[PDB]
């Protein structure tokens, strides 16, 4: 629907007033069919739209909703280094060990992208650094050579 498209676009853009106008019980968890089925919350999380994330969560957005590839909004937040968004999602009950269709967790994303504080956040909430994805790789396995601090963090040594 045109309405849902506009809502998804507003969430992506951080257009709070438009989100407020278009967010209904029926649209808050709509999906971007023409893309990868991201919800308004996936878009707000991935594009670091904090006010929109907060509003959507308050109005019944599903923190656990998976897109077409099995990503939840916490994956989007962690892959793009959005610490505050990640913390909002976790505080609202996001599962930190959630895995997409390829068994990538948010810790796989934060590790591969060199996001130390996000890795640390996830670990404090019980994220498992030993979880292998379908490639048999743990988050530690995906850390760039240069990020020795993240390596040490994930190893626990």
């Amino acid at each position: 629907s045109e309405a849902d498209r506009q809502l998804l676009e507003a969430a992506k853009a951080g257009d709070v007033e438009t989100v407020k106008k278009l967010c209904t019980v029926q649209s808050v968890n709509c999906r971007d069919i023409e893309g990868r089925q991201s919800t308004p919350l996936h878009f707000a999380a991935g594009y670091n739209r904090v006010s929109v994330v907060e509003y959507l969560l308050q109005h019944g957005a599903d923190v656990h909703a998976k897109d077409k590839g099995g990503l939840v909004p916490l994956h989007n937040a962690c892959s793009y280094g959005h610490y505050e968004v990640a913390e909002l999602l976790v505080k609202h009950g996001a599962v930190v060990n959630v895995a997409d269709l390829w068994k990538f967790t948010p810790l796989h994303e934060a590790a591969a992208k060199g996001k130390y504080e996000i890795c640390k956040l996830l670990l404090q909430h019980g994220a498992d650094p030993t979880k292998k994805n379908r490639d048999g790789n743990t988050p530690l396995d995906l850390v760039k050579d240069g990020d020795t601090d993240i390596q040490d963090l994930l190893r626990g040594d």
Binding site: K12, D32, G35, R36, S38, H42, F43, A45, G46, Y47, N48, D67, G69, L71, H75, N76, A77, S79, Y80, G81, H82, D100, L101, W102, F104, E109, K113, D135
Partner: peptide
């Protein structure tokens, strides 16, 4: 994993 694609979003608002 090309089929996996990438999460909607980006790291820098700029």
């Amino acid at each position: 994993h090309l089929q996996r694609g990438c999460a909607d979003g980006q790291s820098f608002r700029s």
